[model samples]
Target chain A: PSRKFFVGGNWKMNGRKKNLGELITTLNAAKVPADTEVVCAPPTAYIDFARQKLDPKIAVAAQNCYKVTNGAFTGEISPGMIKDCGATWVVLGHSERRHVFGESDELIGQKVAHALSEGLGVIACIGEKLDEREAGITEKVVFEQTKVIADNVKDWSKVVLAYEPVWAIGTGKTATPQQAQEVHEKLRGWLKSNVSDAVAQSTRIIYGGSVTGATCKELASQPDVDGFLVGGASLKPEFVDIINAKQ
Target chain B: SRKFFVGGNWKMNGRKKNLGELITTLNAAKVPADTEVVCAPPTAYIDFARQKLDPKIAVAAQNCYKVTNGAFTGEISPGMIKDCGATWVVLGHSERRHVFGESDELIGQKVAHALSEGLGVIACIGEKLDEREAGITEKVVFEQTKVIADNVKDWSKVVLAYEPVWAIGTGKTATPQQAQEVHEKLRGWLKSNVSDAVAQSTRIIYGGSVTGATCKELASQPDVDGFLVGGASLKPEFVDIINAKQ
Candidate 1:
C-alpha cells in the first residue's frame, strides 16, 4: 500500500558534460513530485559530473554492466565498478540490449541477479516485439521475460519493472492509453498470481515508449500505470512536465 | 634503437582506484630499459591515468572519433583525447571492427583525423575465424592496411597491430609458425603495397592472446616487431611481455 511512484530518465548516449549542468539546473528549479523517486543514467563519462551538480536526492544509474568484476571485455561498464564510482543504480536489459546488442533474456536475468548481489538497485526493462503484439502474444512475451528476473531475484524490493513497448521505442509511435492499460493491468495481475499480492499492489510498474507531456496525463490516469521510464522526451524540457504529471 | 615496442590495450577495464595503483606499479616495476611502454585506459579514467603515469611511460585511448568535433553525441574525438594528455590511440581494434560494426573506411578516416590533429596511432587489423579458415588471411588484412595507406601516405606516425580475430580473447593463440607466417606475409604486403622504407620502418605488432611465456617465441620471429597485449597487460606479467624482445 505504500509504493512510491517512480520515474527515470535514461539519457542513453545523449548529452555532454556542459549540457548536463543546464539539464540538472532546470530539473532542480522545476517543481516535481515529492513522492516520486527520480534518477538519470548518463553516459559513464559524466556520472561523476552529474552526481556533483544535481540535487543530492536525484540519483544516477550506469547505462550497462559486464559480468566479471574486472577484465578485458572492451567498452563495457561493470555493475560493481559502477557502484564504486559513486553511482547507486543501473539500467539493465533495456531495448538497446535486446535489439542493438542482442542480449538474451537469460543474460539480462544474470545481470539483474549480479547487480542485486553487488547491492545496486535495478531498472529491469521488459517488452514485447512488434510481431508478438500483432500475434496477440504481447502479455505472454512480456511475462516470459519478466519471469526470468522474478525467479532469479529473491528480493524484488529494489527492482522496478519498466514496461517499454518495443514498437514505440524511438519510432515516434506511441501505445494508446487503452493499449498501455491493458498490458499494465495484465502485468500487475501476473505479479499478483506469480510473485505475491503485496508486490502486485505495491510495486511501481511504469510505462516507457514515447512518453510525452501530452500523453503522460492520460496514461497516468490508468490504475496500474504509476510513472514513466522516459526515453527521447527525457532529453527535452517536457521531461520536467512528465515528471510532474501527477501534479 | 629499440625495435620492439610494447603497448597495453586496457580495453574498457580500470576503475579510478585501480588505475592509480596500476600506474604506480608501471612506474615502480623494473621494466626493460630497451622497450617503449604505453598503456591505454578508458576515456573516463584517461586524465587520472595520465596524471599519475610516469612521463617516460605514455598513455593511449581505447578509441577516438573520425570527426575532430561536432554533433556526435557519445564519441570522444582525437582533439579531446589529446587535450586529456594521451599521446597515442589504438584505432580500429578488432572489437571495434566485429562487435561495434566499424568499417575500414571509417578507421581510415579516424587515422586521417587523428594525425591531422598530430596524435600517434596504433592502427589494428586482423582476419576473423571464418576468414582465416577460408585461407583469405592475406587478402583480408591487406584490404584493411591498404585503406589506411590510401588515406594517409605518411606512415611514420602509425604502428600496425595484426590481431587475428579468431585468436583474440578466445584463448586460441596463433602458433609461432602461424604468427611468423602472417607477420612475414604482412611485411611483404607492406613492401609491395606501400614502399620499402615504410615496410622496413613501420612496426608490425602481434595481438590476440599474447602472454609472457608465449611472447619470447613470437618475439623471436624476424617479422614479429612488437606486441599489443590484451588481458595479460593488466597484471605484473606485462613487464615480462614488454621485455620479451630484450
Candidate 2:
C-alpha cells in the first residue's frame, strides 16, 4: 500500500477536560477526507479522553514519552504506558524537548527506538534553530537528527518526519513552501543515501512551525512535503482546513 | 455539613484499558455516604477517568499549571480541568516538591490559582527523612504550613494531608504516636494561625505509607482525623481506610 498523507495536531498544553470534548466533537463531526490520516495530541493528561471521544479513523498520539519503558522517571509518560492507553502514535524530538528541555539527538533517537519497539507509530520531529539556518546549517542539523534514527531503526514505515523550524513555531513566521520543500528534499535524499530506497520513498516528511490554512495548500503541493505537524494552528478551527490542505 | 474528603493519587501509573477497571473498582466500592471521593489519575488518564467515573465520585487532575492559561507547552490549567468536570485538585505533594523542584512559593501560587477557580484543594505538606532524623519535625512541618496559611486564609475549602515525606510509598509507616505528634502540631498551628473552631473542624489527614491495619490506631488520634493513604489506597483495603473513622 502507498503511504497516504498524514496530518497531526500537536495540541501542546492547550484544552481543559471540558474543552477537549468539544475539540473532539468538532473533529468527529467534521468530514475529514478519507485519504488523509488524522491524529490529535492533547496534553498527556487528556490522551485517553481524546481517544474515547475521537472516531476510530481520527486516532490519538501522546505529547511526550520517557526513554525507558518504565520505572523511577517521575512525572514522565512512557511509550509502553501510552500504548497501553490506546494512543497508537507518539510525538518524539519536538523543538521543546530539544531546545527547552535540552534533549539531544541521541536521547530522541533512543526514545524513537523504544517507541518503535513497543509497536507504536512515531511522529519524529527534526528542525533547525534560527542560528543554524542563518549559518546555512539547516540541512546539516536536520540531516544529523534524522540520520541518528535512520542508523538505529530499520523500520521507517511507522515513522512520520515532522520538519518544525524552532524560529517559526508559535512565532507566526512560517517557512515558505519552496523553503520547506528544499530542506524536505534534502531529508528524503539523506534517507535514500543512508537507509534503503524503500524507506526513503515511503517515509512521510511533514512540515510544522506556524502552519496556517492559508499556507498549507501551497506547501502540500510540494511532493516531498507530505503533511504537517501543526502547532498553534492545530488549536483553532482552521486546523480542519490544514487537515484537508491537499484537497 | 462538612463533606468527607477522599483522594487517590494514581501516582505515576494507569493506562487506557486499566482505567476502566480502576474506575469500576472505585464505583463498585462502598465509599462513605457523605465523603467526596476524588481520584488523581495521571495526566494521560484524566480525560478517560472523567468520562468513565460516576458523577458522585469526582475526578481530579494529579497536577495542573500555576498559570490560568497561555503559551506554556505540555501543561493543563485549572480552568481546563474544571471544564472537564473535575472540581478538586491535588497540589504540593512531596513528589512535586522534592522530585520536580516545585518550591513552596510556586505551590502557594497554584493553591491560590486553584481556589480562585472555585476548585477544592488537597494541599499536602510533610517533613523529609533528614528533617525527621534531626528532631525538628514540628519546625519543618510548621514552616511548610505557614506558606499555605498565609496564602489560603479560608480553611474551610482546604483538606490538609500531613504526608511525612519519608513514609510516603516507602512501606515504613510512622508509629501512631509519631504520626499524631505532627498532626497535633499542625492542628495547634491551625488553631493559633486560623481559629479554634477552624482547627477543630478542619480535616488534617495523615499520609505516608498508611495501611488498613494501621489506620484504626492512627484515626483514633484526636488530631489525626483521617488519612491520605498511599499504596494501601490502591487495594480493596482502601475501603477499610475510609471506614477508619467508623
Candidate 3:
C-alpha cells in the first residue's frame, strides 16, 4: 500500500482566465500536505495558462484529449498538445464524456493507453448510472467499463481509477462512504483477480462524483478510497480542504 | 457581391513556438487591402493567436458549444471564444458532421447561440460521399442550411462554407466549375428561400482540399467568394491562397 493520496480537480468545461488565475494563486499559497499529490484538469483553452501560473507542486492536466497525437480531428486536442502545454496528466472517460459526448468505452480506453504511451498520467473513470445501480447491476456495469480501461493500461502506476457514480454527480447526491468503499473494494478485488496483486496494491483508486469539503473526510477514511476527483467544488477555495482531507 | 474573405482553419494543429512563427510570417505578408483574412487555431491556441497576431488578421475558434457558458464538459462556449478574442467560430465542418457525429440540429443551435452572443459564424454544409453518389447532394446541403438559417436572425453575421465532400480527399477534388456550381446553387437557395439581398451580400467560401496550388482557379470562380483553408493553412503557402484573390 505505497499508493500516495491522489486528488484531481476535473474543472469540467468551466473557468475563465481571470478567475482561474486567482484560483491558481490561491492554490499556490495553500499548504498542500507533502504526501498528497494534487492535479488540476482545466479546460483545454486554459491548460497552458494553468501550467504557466500554477505552482509546480500542483500538476496540470487536460480535461480530455484525442487518441492520437495530431491530425484533422477538428475540435479535439491531442495528448502531444497537452504535453507541449506542460500538463503532466489527462482525465479520460469522465461520465460527461460517456453520456453527454457519446465517447465509447473503446474510445476512452484507447485514449487512456495513448496518453500513457505519450507519458502523461491518466485519471480513468468508471461508474454505473442510477438505473444500473437501481437494477442491482452496479458491479457488472462498473466491471465492464473498468475492463476496457484496464485492457488499455499496461503501466498501472501512471493510471488512477476513479469511481464516480452517475446518480451522484451534479445531482446534489453523494454516494455514502460505505457505498463508495464497497465499489472501491470490489474494484480492487477485480484487479487482484484479473491483474497482478502488485498492481492492486500499488495503483491508486480514487473516488469522484460531487466530492466536496464536507463529504471528503469520511470518503477519505475508507481504507480502499485513496483520494478524490472533485467536480464543481474544485473551482472554489474549499478544494484546498478536500485536497488536504487525508491530512 | 460580398467582400472577398479568406479564413484558414488550423484544425487541431500547431504549438506556441511554431504557431508563433507562423503568426509572425502572416503578420509580415503583404496581403491585398480588399481581401479580409481570418485565421482559426484550435480552441487551446485561440487566446495566444489573438494576442500575438496583428489586428489586421482576425481570429476564429474552430468549434464552440451552443450555450454561452455552462457545465458541458469538454466544450467551450461562444462567449469563451469571444473572450479569447476570436471573432468567429467554424461550425458544422465535415469532420464535425461525419467524424465527430455532431447533429445538424446541434450545429443549428450553436449557430444561433454564437450569433446571438455577437460572434460571427462560418456555417458549413456539404453532402457525404454516399449522399453525393446517390445524387442527393443538393437536398442534403439544403437541409443543412435550412437548420441554421431558421435560427439565424441576421445574415450579415453568417458566412456560408461549402465542402464538396466528394471533392475533398475522396480521390477527386472540386473543379472550378464544380465548386462554382454548388456555390451558385447555395446562393440561389439563399435568394429564393431567404432573399436576393442576403444572397448577394453573404460570402460563400469553399473548403476541403483547397491548397495554394489550386487556390487560383478556385478563387477565380464568380461565386467562389473565398476559401476556408485546412492543411494548407498551417504553411507559408497560405499567403498564396490569401493572395489568390489578387
Each predicted complex: what DockQ?
A: 0.30, 0.32, 0.73
Tens digit of lDDT per residue, candidate 1, span B30-130? 76667778898765566567778888788888887777643232356776667667888888898888866778988999899898988899999999988
Q: For candidate 1, lDDT tens digit of each residue in A71-174?
A: 66555567766776678888788887777557788888888888988888888888988999899998779999889978767777888888999998887788
Which lDDT tens digits does candidate 3 get at residues A81-186? 8888899898889898899889999899889989999999999889999999889999999999999999998999899999999998998798999999999999
Residue-wise C-alpha lDDT for candidate 2, range A49-141, written one tens digit per residue = 678778998888997787776443335677877877778999988888777556778888888988898899989888999999999888879
In the order shown, what is each candidate's alpha-carbon RMSD? Answer: 4.3, 3.9, 1.2
lDDT of 1 at B161: 90
True contacts kept of each: 0.20, 0.39, 0.63
Question: Which window of ten consecutive residues has the lowest lDDT sum in model 1 chain B?
Answer: B67-76
DockQ for model 1? Answer: 0.30
Instruction: TM-score each candidate.
Output: 0.81, 0.83, 0.98
lDDT of 1: 0.81
| Model 2, CA-based lDDT | 0.80
Report the number of clashing residue pairs per model.
0, 7, 0
- By TM-score, rank the candidates, best first: 3, 2, 1
Model 2 is docked with a DockQ of: 0.32
